[PDB]
Amino acid sequence: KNHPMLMNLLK
Amino acid sequence: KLSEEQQHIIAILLDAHHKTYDPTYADFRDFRPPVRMSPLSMLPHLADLVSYSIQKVIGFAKMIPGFRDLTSDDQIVLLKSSAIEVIMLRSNQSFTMDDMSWDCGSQDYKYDVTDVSKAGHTLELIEPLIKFQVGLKKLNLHEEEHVLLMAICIVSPDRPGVQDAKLVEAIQDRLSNTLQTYIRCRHPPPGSHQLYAKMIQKLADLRSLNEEHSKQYRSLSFQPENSMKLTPLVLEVFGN
Ligand SMILES: C=C1[C@H](O)CC(=C/C=C2\CCC[C@]3(C)[C@@H]([C@H](C)C(=O)/C=C/C=C/C)CC[C@@H]23)C[C@H]1O
C-alpha cells in the first residue's frame, strides 16, 4: 500500500 | 498461576524494550538541534525525535510474540495506526511529575509544554496528553506491565485496514491474558486494585489522543513549508 520505508524496517 | 509461556512472553517483551529504549538518550545528539529562543522553532528537533522514536517502536513490535505470523499488510496497518500512541506510552519513562515535562538527561533535551507548542501543536492535544502522562505515571506500573501495555496497544484488531482481525485478536488475547495474570500473581494490593481496567482505560485515552494528533498533524502537515521540516519516515507513517 505504498509504505516502502515501513516495510523495509519491518523486514 | 502464571504459565511458563506467559513468563516467556514477559521476558521477551522486557528484553525487546531494553534493546529499543536507551535510558542514556545518547542518540539525541544526532537530531537537529533544539531551538527555544520563533514559530515552529522546536519542530525540526521534535520531528527527528518522533521519527527516531518510530524506528524504535518498529523494532519493539517485531520482537512481540505472534507479530511475525501476521501478513506484511497487517503488520504495516498496525504500526501506522499505533505508532503515535506507543510513542506517547513509551515517553512516560522520560516524563517527570515534578516539573511536568519529559526529561531526557539534559536541559537541552528536557521538553515542556512550551517546547511542544513550539512544535506546532495546540493545547487541545497537549493538555490531555499531559493529563495522560500524569495518570499513567500515577499507576506506577511495573516495567513488565509497561512493556505488555505497549505490545497490546500495537496489536489491536479494530485498527483501520486490518484484514486478519481474527488473527490480530488472537495475538492480543494472549498478551492480555498474560497481563491480567501477571497483575494478579505479581502485583500486590492496593496498587493492583483495578489495575487492568485502568490500563485498558489508558488505551482508550490513547485513541482519543491519536485522533487529535492526526487532526493537528493534518493542519500542520498541510502547509508545504512545515511538511518540509519533517522526516521521510514521519511523512510515510503519519501520512504525507
Ligand atoms: C525516547 C523517547 C520517546 O520515544 C519519546 C519522548 C518524548 C515524547 C514526547 C515529548 C514531547 C512531546 C511529544 C513529542 C508529543 C507530541 C504531540 C508529538 O507527537 C510531537 C510531534 C512533532 C512533530 C514534528 C508526543 C510524544 C511527546 C522522549 C523519550 O522518552
Side-chain angles (χ1 to χ4, degrees), chain A, chain B residues 1-28 30-98 100-183 185-214 216-240:
Chain A
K1 300 296 181 184
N2 302 280
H3 296 99
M5 279 160 200
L6 180 59
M7 215 190 337
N8 187 41
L9 292 183
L10 265 189
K11 155 204 187 105
Chain B
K1 230 168 139 175
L2 236 180
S3 82
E4 293 287 6
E5 164 149 316
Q6 284 175 344
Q7 291 164 74
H8 186 53
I9 293 185
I10 296 183
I12 290 160
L13 289 174
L14 284 176
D15 190 44
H17 178 58
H18 294 143
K19 276 150 147 81
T20 43
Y21 193 104
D22 177 13
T24 65
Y25 308 105
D27 298 341
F28 280 44
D30 303 327
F31 309 158
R32 291 170 278 179
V35 176
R36 321 173 162 77
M37 294 178 71
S38 54
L40 313 175
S41 56
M42 285 300 286
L43 158 48
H45 179 79
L46 293 186
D48 281 354
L49 176 64
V50 171
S51 191
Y52 166 94
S53 295
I54 294 177
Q55 290 185 58
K56 295 307 171 196
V57 171
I58 290 159
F60 175 80
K62 303 172 71 169
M63 291 175 187
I64 311 177
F67 180 85
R68 53 181 184 175
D69 301 339
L70 289 149
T71 59
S72 151
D73 290 84
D74 274 346
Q75 284 178 196
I76 292 183
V77 312
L78 289 177
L79 274 171
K80 245 183 78 87
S81 38
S82 70
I84 192 57
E85 297 179 20
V86 178
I87 293 164
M88 285 162 183
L89 270 165
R90 80 203 310 266
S91 80
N92 206 233
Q93 186 163 164
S94 68
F95 188 77
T96 165
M97 287 275 233
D98 308 1
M100 297 279 107
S101 86
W102 287 273
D103 183 9
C104 298
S106 86
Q107 197 66 241
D108 277 4
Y109 307 145
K110 187 150 160 313
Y111 316 104
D112 75 351
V113 174
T114 194
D115 301 342
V116 181
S117 160
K118 303 267 177 86
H121 280 296
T122 91
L123 201 56
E124 194 135 354
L125 183 62
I126 302 158
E127 184 280 335
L129 170 68
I130 300 286
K131 296 291 168 72
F132 170 88
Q133 295 296 335
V134 170
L136 188 55
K137 206 68 177 220
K138 300 263 184 110
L139 293 175
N140 196 192
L141 299 167
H142 298 191
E143 179 168 40
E144 291 87 337
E145 284 154 355
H146 186 72
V147 295
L148 275 170
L149 189 67
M150 295 187 290
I152 290 166
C153 179
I154 294 165
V155 193
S156 294
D158 49 300
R159 298 256 172 223
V162 183
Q163 283 151 12
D164 212 345
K166 270 287 170 298
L167 195 269
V168 170
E169 211 193 326
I171 308 286
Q172 199 186 57
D173 282 352
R174 196 148 47 110
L175 303 159
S176 305
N177 287 328
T178 306
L179 176 54
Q180 294 169 49
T181 300
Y182 175 84
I183 295 169
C185 280
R186 283 305 136 63
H187 206 113
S192 69
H193 165 70
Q194 295 295 30
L195 183 57
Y196 180 68
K198 286 189 202 162
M199 287 168 77
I200 296 316
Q201 173 59 220
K202 294 298 160 212
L203 288 176
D205 295 346
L206 283 167
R207 298 300 183 99
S208 158
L209 283 175
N210 188 340
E211 165 178 67
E212 187 55 47
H213 175 266
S214 289
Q216 298 198 189
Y217 178 87
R218 268 186 242 96
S219 326
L220 158 61
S221 97
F222 169 75
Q223 188 132 238
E225 72 230 14
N226 289 318
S227 175
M228 257 173 39
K229 300 312 220 127
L230 301 178
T231 75
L233 181 54
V234 173
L235 279 149
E236 195 190 86
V237 171
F238 298 151
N240 165 293

